[PDB]
């Protein structure tokens, strides 16, 4: 379980206790007990052996955080070095935002499947987060072309800010 509930929330399961009002045996319970004893125990033993071997030959890998280079806004046009660094960090942030959108979509699908018949009521916050992140994504990356760039994103943001400022005049 590398994943954490902070980024992939899951409500605690509330399963009811059995109430076997009938006298018949339960083939589901018998098959689950036999399935555990026959399949789950050897698989658990194999995985424990594998994990013991991994703990013997344990190694590590890291994350490689990048630091913020100067952006496209604060250096002169025609300077290909600053433009290159700003373009690379913008493409990096673009890919990160793609995966943020993927995380929100996974969260929404998990909410819908977990709630089932009550998805129209108790998935309100998941749908609200999905709508807000969709609106922000549409504000920053939507109309950019197949040659999307930091310069094009900046031009779109400046046009949107100009329209909002003009609307705020009246």
């Amino acid at each position: 379980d590398s994943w954490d509930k902070d980024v992939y929330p899951e409500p605690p399961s509330r399963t009811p206790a059995p109430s076997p009002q009938t006298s018949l045996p339960n083939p589901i319970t018998y098959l689950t007990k036999a399935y555990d004893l026959v399949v789950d125990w050897p698989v658990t033993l194999v995985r424990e052996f594998i994990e013991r071997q991994h703990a013997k030959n344990r190694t590590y890998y890291y994350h490689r955080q990048y630091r913020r280079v100067p952006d496209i806004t604060e250096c002169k046009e025609g300077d290909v070095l600053c433009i290159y660094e700003a373009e690379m960090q913008w493409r990096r942030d673009f890919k990160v935002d793609q995966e943020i959108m993927n995380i929100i979509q996974e969260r929404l699908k998990a909410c819908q499947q977990r709630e089932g018949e009550n998805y129209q009521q108790n998935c309100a916050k998941e749908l609200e987060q999905f709508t807000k992140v969709t609106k922000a994504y549409q504000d920053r990356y939507l109309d950019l072309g197949a040659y999307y760039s930091a310069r094009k994103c900046l031009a779109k943001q400046k046009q949107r800010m100009l329209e909002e400022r003009k609307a705020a005049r009246q």
């Binding site: 496209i72 806004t73 604060e74 250096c75 002169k76 046009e77 025609g78 300077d79 109309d143 950019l144 072309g145 197949a146 310069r151 094009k152 900046l154 031009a155 779109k156 400046k158 046009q159 100009l162």
Partner: peptide, 15 residues
């Protein structure tokens, strides 16, 4: 040359 904070490049959407 001035930075990309004073020049207003027109934006051409590709809808």
């Amino acid at each position: 040359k001035k930075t990309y904070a004073e020049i207003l490049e027109p934006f051409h959407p590709v809808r």
